[PDB]
Amino acid sequence: LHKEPATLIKAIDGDTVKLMYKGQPMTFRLLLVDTPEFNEKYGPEASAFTKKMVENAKKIEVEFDKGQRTDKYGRGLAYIYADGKMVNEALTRQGLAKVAYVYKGNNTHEQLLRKAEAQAKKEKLNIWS
Numbered sequence: 203l204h205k206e207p208a209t210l211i212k213a214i215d216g217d218t219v220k221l222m223y224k225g226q227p228m229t230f231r232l233l234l235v236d237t238p239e240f241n242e243k244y245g246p247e248a249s250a251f252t253k254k255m256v257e258n259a260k261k262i263e264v265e266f267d268k269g270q271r272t273d274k275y276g277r278g279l280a281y282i283y284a285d286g287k288m289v290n291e292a293l294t295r296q297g298l299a300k301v302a303y304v305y306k307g308n309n310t311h312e313q314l315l316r317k318a319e320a321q322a323k324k325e326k327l328n329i330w331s
């Protein structure tokens with residue numbers, strides 16, 4: 203797995219972000235996580251968490267897994283990194299996201315995220331309170 207560059211176009215919600223990638227606008231859906239929708243509980247907190255994380259980043263990178271790069275809705279599927287810190291993992295650690303939509307082929311960082319979730323649960327953080 204390798205990181206490629208990309209620029210914020212726009213925050214969208216907890217687990218989606220508009221990025222410019224290879225000079226094209228594209229909606230990215232975070233691999234292996236599920237944030238609440240904005241209208242659900244901790245949804246706005248999730249949205250704000252991701253928003254602030256990508257918005258304050260000097261360097262946004264995109265990392266595809268070995269499997270599918272696009273979903274059935276045309277959204278990019280990637281791990282997203284904000285100055286070297288993975289958004290997917292950071293949401294999970296803070297209990298603003300659950301591990302989810304784990305498909306074999308696109309699962310390189312599963313254990314790492316389950317590790318993060320386990321620690322969020324332990325602290326009964328946000329969603330787990």
Ligand SMILES: Cc1cn([C@H]2C[C@H](OP(=O)(O)O)[C@@H](COP(=O)(O)O)O2)c(=O)[nH]c1=O
Pocket residue numbers: 231232233234235236273274279302303305308
């Ligand atoms: C995270 C992820 C979601 N999806 C699809 C499956 C879900 O389909 P359905 O709409 O058929 O339930 C949908 C969930 O995304 P959201 O949580 O953004 O809705 O996005 C993938 O296909 N691959 C993935 O890696």
Ligand SMILES: [Ca+2]
Pocket residue numbers: 217236237238239
């Ligand atoms: Ca969601």
